[PDB]
Amino acid sequence: FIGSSTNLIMVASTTATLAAARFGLAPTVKKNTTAGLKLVDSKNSAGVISNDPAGFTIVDVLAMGAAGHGLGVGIVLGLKGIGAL
Amino acid sequence: VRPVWFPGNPPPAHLDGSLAGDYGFDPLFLGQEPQTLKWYVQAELVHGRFAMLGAAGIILTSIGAKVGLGFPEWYDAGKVVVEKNNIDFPTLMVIQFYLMGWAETKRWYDFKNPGSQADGSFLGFTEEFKGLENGYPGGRFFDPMGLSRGDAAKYQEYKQKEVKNGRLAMIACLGFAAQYAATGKGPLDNLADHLADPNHVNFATNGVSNPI
Amino acid sequence: MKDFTTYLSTAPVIATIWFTFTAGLLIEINRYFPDPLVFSF
Amino acid sequence: WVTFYWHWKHLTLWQGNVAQFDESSTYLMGWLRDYLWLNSSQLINGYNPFGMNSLSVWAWTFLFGHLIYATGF
Amino acid sequence: LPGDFGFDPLGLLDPVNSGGFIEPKWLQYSEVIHARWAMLGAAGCIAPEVLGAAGLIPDATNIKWFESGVIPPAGSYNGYWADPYTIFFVEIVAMQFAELRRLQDFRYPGSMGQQYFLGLEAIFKGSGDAAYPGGPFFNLFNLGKTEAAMKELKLKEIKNGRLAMLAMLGYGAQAVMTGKGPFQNLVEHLADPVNNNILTNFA
Amino acid sequence: KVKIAVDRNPVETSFEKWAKPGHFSRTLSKGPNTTTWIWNLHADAHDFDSHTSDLEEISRKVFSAHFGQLGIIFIWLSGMYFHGARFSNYEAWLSDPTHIKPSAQVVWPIVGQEILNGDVGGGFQGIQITSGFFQLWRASGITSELQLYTTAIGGLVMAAAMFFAGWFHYHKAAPKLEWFQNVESMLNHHLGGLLGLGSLAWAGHQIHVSLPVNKLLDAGVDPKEIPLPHDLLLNRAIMADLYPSFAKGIAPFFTLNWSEYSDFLTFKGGLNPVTGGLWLSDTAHHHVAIAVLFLVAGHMYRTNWGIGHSMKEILEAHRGPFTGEGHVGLYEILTTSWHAQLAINLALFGSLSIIVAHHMYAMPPYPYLATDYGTQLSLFTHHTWIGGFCIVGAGAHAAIFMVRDYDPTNNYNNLLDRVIRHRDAIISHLNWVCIFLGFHSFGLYIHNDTMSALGRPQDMFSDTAIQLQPVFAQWIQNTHFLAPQLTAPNALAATSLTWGGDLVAVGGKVAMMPISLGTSDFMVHHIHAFTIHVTVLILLKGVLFARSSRLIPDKANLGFRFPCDGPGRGGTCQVSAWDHVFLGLFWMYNSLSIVIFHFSWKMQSDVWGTVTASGVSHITGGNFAQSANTINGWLRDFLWAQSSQVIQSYGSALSAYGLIFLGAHFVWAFSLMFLFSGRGYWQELIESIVWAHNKLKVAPAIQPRALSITQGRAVGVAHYLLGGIATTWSFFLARIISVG
Numbered sequence A: 001f002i003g004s005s006t007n008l009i010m011v012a013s014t015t016a017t018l019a020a021a022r023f024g025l026a027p028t029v030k031k032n033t034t035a036g037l038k039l040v041d042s043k044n045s046a047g048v049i050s051n052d053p054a055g056f057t058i059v060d061v062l063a064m065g066a067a068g069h070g071l072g073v074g075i076v077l078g079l080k081g082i083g084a085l
Numbered sequence B: 001v002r003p004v005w006f007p008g009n010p011p012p013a014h015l016d017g018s019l020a021g022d023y024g025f026d027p028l029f030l031g032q033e034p035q036t037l038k039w040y041v042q043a044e045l046v047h048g049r050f051a052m053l054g055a056a057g058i059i060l061t062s063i064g065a066k067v068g069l070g071f072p073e074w075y076d077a078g079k080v081v082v083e084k085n086n087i088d089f090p091t092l093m094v095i096q097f098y099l100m101g102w103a104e105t106k107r108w109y110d111f112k113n114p115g116s117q118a119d120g121s122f123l124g125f126t127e128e129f130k131g132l133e134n135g136y137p138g139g140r141f142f143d144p145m146g147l148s149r150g151d152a153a154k155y156q157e158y159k160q161k162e163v164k165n166g167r168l169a170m171i172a173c174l175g176f177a178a179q180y181a182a183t184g185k186g187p188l189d190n191l192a193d194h195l196a197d198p199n200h201v202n203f204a205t206n207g208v209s210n211p212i
Numbered sequence C: 001m002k003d004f005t006t007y008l009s010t011a012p013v014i015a016t017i018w019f020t021f022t023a024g025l026l027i028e029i030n031r032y033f034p035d036p037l038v039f040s041f
Numbered sequence D: 001w002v003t004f005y006w007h008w009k010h011l012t013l014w015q016g017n018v019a020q021f022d023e024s025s026t027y028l029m030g031w032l033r034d035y036l037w038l039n040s041s042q043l044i045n046g047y048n049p050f051g052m053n054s055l056s057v058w059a060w061t062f063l064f065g066h067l068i069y070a071t072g073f
Numbered sequence E: 001l002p003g004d005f006g007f008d009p010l011g012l013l014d015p016v017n018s019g020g021f022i023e024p025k026w027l028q029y030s031e032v033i034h035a036r037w038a039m040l041g042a043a044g045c046i047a048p049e050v051l052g053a054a055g056l057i058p059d060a061t062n063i064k065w066f067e068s069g070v071i072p073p074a075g076s077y078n079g080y081w082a083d084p085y086t087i088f089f090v091e092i093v094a095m096q097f098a099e100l101r102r103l104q105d106f107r108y109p110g111s112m113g114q115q116y117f118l119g120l121e122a123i124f125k126g127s128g129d130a131a132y133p134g135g136p137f138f139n140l141f142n143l144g145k146t147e148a149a150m151k152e153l154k155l156k157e158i159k160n161g162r163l164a165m166l167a168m169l170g171y172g173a174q175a176v177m178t179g180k181g182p183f184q185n186l187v188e189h190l191a192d193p194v195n196n197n198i199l200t201n202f203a
Numbered sequence F: 001k002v003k004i005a006v007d008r009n010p011v012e013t014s015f016e017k018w019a020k021p022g023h024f025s026r027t028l029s030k031g032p033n034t035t036t037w038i039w040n041l042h043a044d045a046h047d048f049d050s051h052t053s054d055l056e057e058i059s060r061k062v063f064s065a066h067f068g069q070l071g072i073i074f075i076w077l078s079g080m081y082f083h084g085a086r087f088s089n090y091e092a093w094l095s096d097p098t099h100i101k102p103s104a105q106v107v108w109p110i111v112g113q114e115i116l117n118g119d120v121g122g123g124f125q126g127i128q129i130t131s132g133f134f135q136l137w138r139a140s141g142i143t144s145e146l147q148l149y150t151t152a153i154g155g156l157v158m159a160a161a162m163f164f165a166g167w168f169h170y171h172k173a174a175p176k177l178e179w180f181q182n183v184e185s186m187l188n189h190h191l192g193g194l195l196g197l198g199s200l201a202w203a204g205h206q207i208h209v210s211l212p213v214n215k216l217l218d219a220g221v222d223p224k225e226i227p228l229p230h231d232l233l234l235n236r237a238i239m240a241d242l243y244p245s246f247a248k249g250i251a252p253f254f255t256l257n258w259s260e261y262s263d264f265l266t267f268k269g270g271l272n273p274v275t276g277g278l279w280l281s282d283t284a285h286h287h288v289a290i291a292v293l294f295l296v297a298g299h300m301y302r303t304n305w306g307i308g309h310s311m312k313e314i315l316e317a318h319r320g321p322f323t324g325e326g327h328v329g330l331y332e333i334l335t336t337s338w339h340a341q342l343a344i345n346l347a348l349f350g351s352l353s354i355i356v357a358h359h360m361y362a363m364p365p366y367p368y369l370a371t372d373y374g375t376q377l378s379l380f381t382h383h384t385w386i387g388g389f390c391i392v393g394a395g396a397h398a399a400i401f402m403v404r405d406y407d408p409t410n411n412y413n414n415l416l417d418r419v420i421r422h423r424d425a426i427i428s429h430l431n432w433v434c435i436f437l438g439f440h441s442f443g444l445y446i447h448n449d450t451m452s453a454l455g456r457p458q459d460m461f462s463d464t465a466i467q468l469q470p471v472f473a474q475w476i477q478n479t480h481f482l483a484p485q486l487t488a489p490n491a492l493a494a495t496s497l498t499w500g501g502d503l504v505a506v507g508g509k510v511a512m513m514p515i516s517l518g519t520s521d522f523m524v525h526h527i528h529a530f531t532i533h534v535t536v537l538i539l540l541k542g543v544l545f546a547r548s549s550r551l552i553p554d555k556a557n558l559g560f561r562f563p564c565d566g567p568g569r570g571g572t573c574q575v576s577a578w579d580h581v582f583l584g585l586f587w588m589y590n591s592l593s594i595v596i597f598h599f600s601w602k603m604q605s606d607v608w609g610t611v612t613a614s615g616v617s618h619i620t621g622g623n624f625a626q627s628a629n630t631i632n633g634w635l636r637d638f639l640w641a642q643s644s645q646v647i648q649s650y651g652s653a654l655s656a657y658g659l660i661f662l663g664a665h666f667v668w669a670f671s672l673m674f675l676f677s678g679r680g681y682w683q684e685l686i687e688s689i690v691w692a693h694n695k696l697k698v699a700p701a702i703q704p705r706a707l708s709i710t711q712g713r714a715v716g717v718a719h720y721l722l723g724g725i726a727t728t729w730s731f732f733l734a735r736i737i738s739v740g
């Protein structure tokens, strides 16, 4: 089953979300979306200690992994809902 | 320190150790008032004395019952003694209330007024119905051998022994009651049954004790 | 324990206890002596 | 009370069964069922989806009273 | 203080405005107690399988750890000297004495060397700390005898305990899913690594 | 930074203050001198804002009180499961649900009450229950009385846990304020944890116990031969026998191949034709989707990490041209006041209850529920009433927030301010629409009455004469009946049978049949709309005119509860918001009485009845479309015709209802003394009787005083509601237990 079609969609969704967050696009723990979809800094965190030039956490892994899996389940069950895959 | 019923907790304030069998056991604080504690002292002593006497009765009658003498077991002796001799039940109960009421009322009004019955109202008796302490009515009738007025420290030892044996007897009679309710057989029969197979005859096998 | 007894000495508690006593007494009399209408005895 | 009482005693007299009064007059369900409920059968049938008869005006007054009364509250 | 690894993101070791059963001097004590019971239980869950596979105990035993009689639906063993209930009453009474006295040492430190307990009194004095009593019996041999070595032994106790706790959760999860022993799982996984995993055993 | 903040041992534990009644307030403490002081002791017991003036202490109080409420609920549930276990005929009911009526209460053989023990079937005697626990228990899979007894013991244990928890959190570990003021963490944990994980856990229980056991019970095997549920957990192959998807285990779930779970997670629509309830596979699928939805919704707010929303930002971003500054300042209102929260939560809670009632008659979820008529009527009626009371409570506590905790300095130009600033337009138009609906909705009935009495039935509003058709509701009815073919392609049937279609009959009786809507329905619906608008008028007027009005410019300084401001300026009786709540209670009674009458008669006329294989013979023959346009129609065909069973119940096993009927009337008429009269007269009469005691030296040293004005009114409305609702209760239960 590994290497099949749903695998590609799930890996693609998770890599897309994680690489979008780490590369300064998606809202992370540090950077926060405003009312006008603008990236501003966050306040009152837990004071994380983790080294990454973006300022990455163990929370964005969980967050963007969860978003990746929701998005991927949506896409897979949708494409199986149509009939094309 | 005194030995406490629960090593580590300090004893309550109203219990000191002047009493007999004082282990500081009172979680609900039922004896906080001194008069209430005094009354409960008398209650514990009386229950203990009837319990000791009763458990001796049960054990001796059962010993006579297992060996082939023809004694009934304690849940049957009332029926067979009332039935077998001639005795009418209610007249026996009424005479019980007569005598017990007389003596017990004397005790009650000796508690209310602590030295009142030593006046001479009863037939002629003076200072043989005067109490010694709370619940220790020692005179010529109740301490005929005369142990209370000699060897005072040894007498305190006797007080301690009385209270301990009384408490043990109270829970023993509770044992007889619940044991007969569970197994439906005589108590020393249960002792021999458990003594024959200890690992497989106990409370965890009746199916009535633990319904799991 | 004194304050617990005083709490038992308040009005509604004693009303509850005493009305339970009176109600139970009448109920027992009506069980053991079923259906009394007249006294004649 | 006096008029309910008089009216029912004379209804049972004029119909014929004084026994109904002397039995059902001693408990309030007797009044509610045997006076208010039984005797209001021809009243509220003063008009229906099937027709109407003489006592339609009374069967309209009978509701009129309630309306005034409830406004009174 | 042992085992402090800079962890705790959820913030439970804050002394400020703390109370009840969440405080530094009870959560640490709970960690060490859980660690000790977990070490003991882990070795106990493995031992019949490894001892029976090496041929040291007979085959009446060598039963899986959830089939001892803990879960009577999953399988019991007749051959104990009594019923498991008769065992359980003994367990109640003995553990009652032990755990209850331990509690009394926590609530009133040092108060376990006064009242007569068959002369066992110099043994139950405890010490300043509550999770490391010591004495002549809890510390038979004087292990370490100093301060520079004591922290090392406490730290090793903690790390082994944490490893044991994770291991015991593993035994529970595996016994739920695949329904076999832990040593059986080690044998099966060391046989075929790619063809035996957690994801192959999704059934 | 959201965290735990708890204080240690704030209030010690002693009986000392139990012997000192009225210890909580400064006014009450000094001891009685009149009999007003007793009623003041009971009136201000839970007024937690009237002991102190600090938020933290009030919050701790309400927290522990919540624990007390939960504990009593657990004692109640434990009682219900115990009485089901020991004093019922549940197993005899499982053996044959039809022809054996549910009974769960047994009375003692004393003065003659033993005639109340009815012949409920199954070799048992007792009082028929309509609470419908038996259908609930069969829906959960319970087959034995032993499991009920175990559940009872568990409930009692949880109750003791709750009371201990309350004691702990008031006396030993009491939280600080800023524990409470973290509403975002509370939202996350409630939405995720409580609702979501409860749904997920209950889905688990259904899938692993309730689906297979009910599949066997509906298959026809008697309940004893059915395997115990732990055999269903432990043995996979039995589940593989029942639903073959389980033979593949949990592999389909983790590889997104969910289509293989189509055996126990379905989407079929209507009902179980052999049972009369919903399909349990739908129910399990439903809770699974609910749990996923709520667990997704629970990660919305910011607690400790950068992700998530803030409530203040969301509120302050919404402001338009017509409303000035918008929502700026509602967060400070809704985190520092408890009465505002109680208002919102009671509102949505009560409305939720009424929706529960409606869905619960329309789509019967429990097995063998729809053919037990009494259960249907009782459940709908009960939830209707609870909803009504809760909504009136919402009105009352919104008023209390208006009086006490409103500060205009923190609240300047704002939605609340602007609502206060055009209350006159609001109330005037609400008054207009109330009068409009009044004239039309009730004058239609008066007109039909007049025309039907004047000899001309051709000039009245009916189905054959001048017609008023609810075209909108009929169109929506057809839309949803057609939905499974265009706008719901994957369902096999409609969501209910009231939208149209065929008939489901269980054991000769009708589970549900399509409901038609005619002219009588039009008129009664507008009656409902009318009474609802009137109640809204009263309550909203109370809220808006709680601080001040043109009549009284300083009504705020008199407080929430006060009787008048004298006979001056004409007379100012009943100007507090409290009296608006009072009159609101009366109108709530009226509106809900009409609602439950509508339901009862409509069901008895168009839905229920027996399938005699000669068409359908309903209970009352289907007279709703012809008679529900005349007040004479209601008074005759409903009240006079349907009371024959409650008035003739004497001598049978049903006489308790025919005896509580009259008592309900008595209390209703007893309320009128308190409503009509006034306290000066009673004060003088009580004074004369006090003289008659002064003569015989039995002067009470506490002083007899008549009730205060507000208390007299409150007692009046209490007796009024009690009598009316008890009458309706007795009537409904006697009727539908007798003929249903």
Ligand code: CLA
Pocket (backbone or CB within 6 Å): E018, E019, E020, E021, E022, F004, F006, F161, F162, F164, F165, F168, F173, F175
């Ligand atoms: C339902 C409402 C509620 C709420 C909001 C709280 C909130 C709180 N309680 Mg509390 N409590 C409650 C109910 C509640 N409790 C009840 C019902 C009891 C009686 C059993 C207690 C007994 C209790 C004690 C004895 C203590 C608290 C403490 C606390 C505080 C810290 C809790 C914490 O972080 O521990 C985190 C919680 C855990 C690590 C435990 C999680 C595991 C347990 C078993 C709970 C599992 C719950 C879950 C629903 C079980 C599902 C069953 C399934 C697994 C089969 C906090 C103020 C503590 C405190 O004041 O310290 C500051 C404290 O000492 N509470």
Ligand code: CLA
Pocket (backbone or CB within 6 Å): F062, F063, F066, F067, F070, F179, F180, F182, F185, F186, F189, F190, F193, F194
């Ligand atoms: C997953 C965690 C969780 C859960 C399950 C709950 C559940 C509940 N909270 Mg709650 N709460 C939480 C987190 C949680 N809260 C947090 C984090 C906070 C702080 C911000 C609060 C603050 C809070 C307040 C201030 C109040 C509640 C209240 C309630 C109860 C609402 C009554 C109801 O309908 O329950 C339905 C009944 C049940 C579901 C019965 C199950 C009850 C058991 C005990 C499950 C409880 C789980 C427990 C909270 C976990 C800790 C246990 C403790 C031993 C450590 C409900 C039991 C209200 C209440 O009733 O107070 C008592 C209330 O006033 N909560």
Ligand code: CLA
Pocket (backbone or CB within 6 Å): E070, E168, E169, E171, E172, E173, E176, E177, F200, F201, F202, F203, F204, F205, F207, F232, F233, F234, F235, F236, F239, F245, F246, F248, F249, F250, F253, F288
């Ligand atoms: C939330 C509720 C819930 C719960 C409790 C369960 C529970 C279960 N489901 Mg399940 N299920 C659910 C919801 C739920 N499900 C839903 C919503 C669906 C629909 C998608 C399914 C669909 C489903 C299928 C299709 C199947 C199950 C199965 C199972 C069982 C085995 C799970 C498995 O294979 O291992 C999962 C592994 C675990 C859950 C790990 C457990 C870890 C343990 C508890 C830790 C203990 C450790 C501890 C230290 C031990 C102490 C040691 C010492 C003190 C003694 C298990 C009883 C399977 C089964 O047996 O069928 C009958 C199966 O075939 N379920």
Ligand code: CLA
Pocket (backbone or CB within 6 Å): D067, D070, D071, D072, D073, F431, F434, F435, F437, F438, F439, F442, F443, F446, F534, F537, F538, F583, F586, F587
């Ligand atoms: C059955 C008795 C009754 C009636 C008819 C009313 C009527 C009314 N109450 Mg009401 N009320 C009552 C009992 C009643 N109440 C009781 C017992 C209480 C105590 C709780 C209250 C408490 C109460 C409050 C607190 C409020 C009302 C309000 C209203 C008005 C609502 C508007 C409306 O429908 O008017 C329309 C009028 C009718 C439906 C009456 C019938 C009209 C007929 C059908 C047609 C009239 C034409 C006529 C025949 C022509 C006259 C000809 C003649 C001159 C010859 C209305 C005047 C509310 C209000 O005024 O605000 C809107 C309001 O706030 N009442």
Ligand code: CLA
Pocket (backbone or CB within 6 Å): F666, F667, F668, F669, F670, F671, F672, F673, F674, F676, F677, F685
């Ligand atoms: C149901 C209607 C009803 C009833 C029962 C009464 C009853 C009474 N009225 Mg009247 N009244 C009414 C309607 C009613 N009124 C109305 C509508 C008005 C117009 C405003 C008045 C105006 C009025 C005035 C102006 C006066 C009275 C007076 C009286 C008393 C007359 C003495 C008497 O008969 O004692 C019999 C008493 C009773 C039958 C009361 C019932 C007691 C019950 C049976 C006992 C409780 C049973 C049980 C323990 C309850 C348990 C429940 C538990 C939760 C507590 C009496 C209390 C006069 C008075 O007090 O003179 C002394 C007086 O001055 N009333």
Ligand SMILES: CC1=C[C@H](O)CC(C)(C)[C@H]1/C=C/C(C)=C/C=C/C(C)=C/C=C/C=C(C)/C=C/C=C(C)/C=C/C1=C(C)C[C@H](O)CC1(C)C
Pocket (backbone or CB within 6 Å): E008, E009, E010, E011, E012, E034, E037, E038, E040, E041, E042, E043, E044, E045, E064, E065, E066, E068, E070, E165, E166, E168, E169
């Ligand atoms: C750190 C942290 C941090 C943050 O802040 C927060 C959080 C996250 C919360 C945290 C975490 C936590 C955790 C993870 C925990 C875990 C735990 C566990 C697992 C335990 C176990 C635990 C476990 C345990 C005790 C166990 C034990 C066991 C035992 C004894 C056993 C026994 C036995 C044996 C021998 C064998 C036999 O045949 C059977 C029996 C008899 C049965």
Ligand code: SF4
Pocket (backbone or CB within 6 Å): F563, F564, F565, F566, F567, F571, F572, F573, F574, F709
């Ligand atoms: S005292 Fe009574 S009548 Fe007078 S104004 Fe006040 S409420 Fe009205």
